[PDB]
Design a protein around this ligand. Structure first.
Ligand SMILES: CCOP(=O)(O)OCC
Ligand SMILES: CCOP(=O)(O)OCC
Ligand SMILES: [Co+2]
Ligand SMILES: [Co+2]
Ligand SMILES: [Co+2]
Ligand SMILES: [Co+2]
Ligand SMILES: [Co+2]
Lengths: 323, 327
């Protein structure tokens, strides 16, 4: 009954309170190694990450799933270092996001499957650290390459038991096409999380997917720019409006299909220069936003602690456990 | 008279026969480390590189300039390993090619200048290995980002003396726009090489750049897809012009008095992941000599056509020496 982390295998019970969609650093392949000064220094980024993970730990978090893929600049050595120093388990990811380089974007579905399988079965780079989740993405209707990635993710999941988590443009209802592609491959809906689902107010869309067995990733809760580049990224909808979608799905009877997270980071190079400073001012709680602000909000709205423990401990454990 | 290599600083006289535009591996940032099995293994790629550079050294080559940038997946540790094993000097590169990731493409000209300067003045990654050349690219009309890269390359060159070398779509005459941007920043033409220039037969375009002081990169000499016209991918990359037609452009520029402006190379690699899967196997069958194609096939070709030995030695030894020297 084991889940692979950056420090090795852990049992289901060791996972505890788990944030299912997080990042230590949102970057690009090889960027942190080639230009650490962008983040001040590698040491400055690592120290910031340790403090943020310790804040989350003190708030109840025991494990985070870093959904940073190869093209998000996942540096598993950094993840292992910060995991050790902060005493928080970190599950690493394979897959591809929306910035694949030529060496990835010109590959066949068979080759992409081999790559995802290499990171889950053998390890990431020369570290021996095995991926425990597959991250994929669509920003509207899937491009021919994105469809290949979704199929390769499904094939890698079916061969390993490792789950698939997605980035969606929720307003364009991407989850429906993602679902259709995954099902055509024979992938069980219970092994898939349709992420960034709190970016929409269309409850019928979320309820329809949850009814089919999909996990609904309400992971953009602190992403709100109420009050230019930050307004186009975070949005105009409040955290309360996003958090009420958790309550709405519990009221529909789909508490077992909900996964909550912050989609936070401590370094962010894949956007405008001072974006990390803007994000830190919008949400000073960081990864601690879910246990410090969202859980007490839901408690005062009438949601029991047994249901909230089910969403934050039981659901991620069932999702991450290789099945 | 000191140039930076992957083994440390060497003197100008030690460079010798230099191939100005080469690659150990044409890939993408972080690719070699994440998926070495694409090339069989990192060990298989390293061994293939050592065998190729050893065959090139036996034929006369003493230095190769690896123009692989961050986005071409430059792994300086691999460059250092193969340089030492084959006893061939390798000059590493900074700059950005045409596949920059989001973290690079959203940067300002000032930020890009600081990155290029970091790789030249401090070192690449945590290796301490310093770049001795700046590689830039355009594929037709420059994109707003490519203009920023060209400007940052020029500013980095003016602060260090390190040369700039380019990738062009020669048929679209990219060298002219590149040249105009470099000169708008105050960069001297003698510090710039307009690469892939042998992809065109337009002698007027080549001679005009050479007259302004630009170095002409006739670096695609063995690139030909004749015999394999049924292979669309290989035809689009290598073209349908012979090595002789490409090599006759070296003779054409010598005859017009632009001897000091010529730089010859193979634009070869031992691993290639940034294109279709079968490409490295296709390319190795077209040119089994690899990087050894310039001293083995091209030099005796120009010798039988009437070109003197000191002229060819001036192109292969003196010109790269003057170009690579930080001035
Ligand atoms: C590094 C960026 O990660 P993300 O979760 O795609 O953020 C925008 C939704
Ligand atoms: C990865 C190398 O790319 P290039 O040298 O621009 O093209 C060679 C055919
Ligand atoms: Co996302
Ligand atoms: Co959003
Ligand atoms: Co994310
Ligand atoms: Co090129
Ligand atoms: Co090249």
């Amino acid at each position: 009954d084991r889940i692979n982390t950056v420090r090795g295998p852990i049992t289901i019970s060791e996972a505890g309170f788990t944030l299912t969609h997080e990042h230590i650093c949102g970057s690009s392949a090889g960027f942190l190694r080639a230009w650490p000064e962008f983040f001040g220094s590698r040491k400055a980024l690592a120290e910031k990450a340790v403090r943020g993970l310790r804040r989350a730990r003190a708030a109840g978090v025991r494990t985070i799933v870093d959904v940073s893929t190869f093209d998000i600049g996942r540096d598993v050595s950094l993840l292992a270092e910060v995991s050790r120093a902060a005493d928080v388990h970190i599950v690493a990811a394979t897959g591809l996001w929306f910035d694949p380089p030529l060496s990835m974007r010109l590959r066949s579905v068979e080759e992409l499957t081999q790559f995802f399988l290499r990171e889950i079965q053998y390890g990431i780079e020369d570290t021996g650290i095995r991926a425990g989740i597959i991250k994929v993405a669509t920003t509207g209707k899937a491009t021919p390459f994105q469809e290949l990635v979704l199929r390769a993710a499904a094939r890698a999941s079916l061969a390993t038991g490792v789950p698939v988590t997605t980035h969606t443009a929720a307003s364009q209802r991407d989850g429906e096409q993602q679902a259709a592609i995954f099902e055509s491959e024979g992938l069980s809906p219970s092994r898939v999380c349709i992420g960034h689902s709190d970016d929409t107010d269309d409850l019928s869309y979320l309820t329809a997917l949850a009814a089919r067995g999909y996990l609904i990733g309400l992971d953009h809760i602190p992403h709100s720019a109420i009050g230019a580049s930050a307004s186009a990224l975070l949005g105009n909808r409040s955290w309360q409006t996003r958090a009420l979608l958790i309550k709405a799905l519990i009221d529909q009877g789909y508490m077992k299909q909900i996964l909550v997270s912050n989609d936070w980071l401590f370094g962010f190079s894949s956007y405008v220069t001072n974006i990390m400073d803007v994000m830190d001012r919008v949400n000073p709680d960081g990864m601690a936003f879910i246990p410090l602000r969202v859980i007490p909000f839901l408690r005062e709205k009438g949601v029991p602690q047994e249901t909230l423990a089910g969403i934050t401990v039981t659901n991620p454990a069932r999702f991450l456990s290789p099945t």
